[PDB]
């Protein structure tokens, strides 16, 4: 299974064994003003090997012209924060998941 996060942040190999669990934590990491501590990456060139950690947050290259670290046209900041509020639906709660 692929998606926006499966092939970009944590890929599960086919020959994988173990278990994954989840629980509701809507009253722990949710504030009316908003939480900005949690960040996630969105833009990358291609998928990577499973079981690795990526720390580099260089500027994304998406056009023929180079941006050289300048946040301008045709190059945006790939890291976005999780915008969560305590007045969301049943599918928009912060869940703490351990693998």
């Amino acid at each position: 299974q692929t998606g926006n996060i499966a092939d970009y942040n944590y890929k599960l190999p086919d020959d994988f064994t173990g278990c994954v669990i989840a629980w509701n934590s809507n009253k722990l990491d949710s504030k009316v003003s908003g939480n900005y501590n949690y960040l996630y990456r969105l833009f990358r060139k291609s998928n990577l090997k499973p079981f690795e950690r990526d720390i580099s947050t260089e500027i994304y290259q998406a056009g023929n012209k180079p941006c050289n670290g300048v946040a301008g046209f045709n190059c945006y900041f790939p890291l976005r924060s999780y915008s969560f509020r305590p007045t969301y639906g049943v599918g928009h709660q912060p869940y703490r998941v351990v693998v």
Partner: antibody, heavy 116, light 109 residues
Framework: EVQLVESGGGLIQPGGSLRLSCAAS????????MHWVRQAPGKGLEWVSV???????FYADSVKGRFTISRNNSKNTLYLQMNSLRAEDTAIYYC??????????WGQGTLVTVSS | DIQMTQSPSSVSASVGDRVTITCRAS??????LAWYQQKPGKAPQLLIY???TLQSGVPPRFSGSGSGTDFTLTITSLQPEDFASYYC??????????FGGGTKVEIKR
């Protein structure tokens, strides 16, 4: 400085094969996301397909997945495969690109009509 | 089976009058929201990127925000070139599938 064009559309019999082309000026097709949106006459804009980094693509729930996405970085183009036509498929096609589950720049559009 | 609805279906207003459009979602979606202006004979253009920030090439008179399942958009100073279809697309977090019927506003004569 940024513009999108479409070509290859026109009259086609049902069950035929036709290949689309969409070139991006100043943008690399193998890096950014893509979107295809369909607008039937008298109906709103409807999403068709989205291209990921590679080896994965998601389609609409109603369709069975009759679009195959192939791209080449040699001349910065996009290629589509057409099969299993239906009378509902007669609509305009809008070449689109996406970022952050959002759409910013759309092409002028090409006409594809199915005449059963 | 997302089952979105847009109300009202149609509305008419003159230059400088009061008009607004409301978009409703069946399930709870976050603060993300977008609006599109579909002019016949041409491809529609983007209006907003974030929940409240405006796009660089659009006038800043557009006002619209929301937190729950209800969203709205309105114009402070109406212009004759703003008469087109209004579409709402908030978020889906997996593939960005949401779109309504729309509402068309017509120029007064």
């Amino acid at each position: 400085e940024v513009q999108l064009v479409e070509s290859g559309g026109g009259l086609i019999q049902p069950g035929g094969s036709l290949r689309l082309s969409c070139a991006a000026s100043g943008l690399t097709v193998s890096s950014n996301y893509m979107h295809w949106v369909r607008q039937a006459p008298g109906k709103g804009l409807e999403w068709v397909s989205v291209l990921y980094a590679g080896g994965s693509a998601f389609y609409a729930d109603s369709v069975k997945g009759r679009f195959t996405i192939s791209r080449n970085n040699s001349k910065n183009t996009l290629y589509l495969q057409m099969n299993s036509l239906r009378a509902e498929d007669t609509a305009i096609y809008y070449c689109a690109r996406g970022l952050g589950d959002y759409l910013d720049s759309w092409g002028q559009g090409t006409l594809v009509t199915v005449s059963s | 089976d997302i089952q979105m609805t847009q109300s009202p279906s149609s509305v008419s207003a003159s230059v400088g009058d009061r008009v607004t459009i409301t978009c409703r979602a069946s399930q709870g979606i976050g603060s993300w929201l977008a609006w599109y202006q579909q002019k016949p004979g041409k491809a529609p253009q983007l209006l907003i990127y974030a929940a409240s920030t405006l796009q660089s090439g659009v006038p800043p008179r557009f006002s619209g925000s929301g937190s729950g399942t209800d969203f709205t958009l309105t114009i402070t100073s109406l212009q004759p070139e703003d008469f087109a279809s209004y579409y709402c697309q908030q978020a889906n977090s997996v593939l960005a599938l949401t779109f309504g019927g729309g509402t068309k506003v017509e120029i007064k004569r």
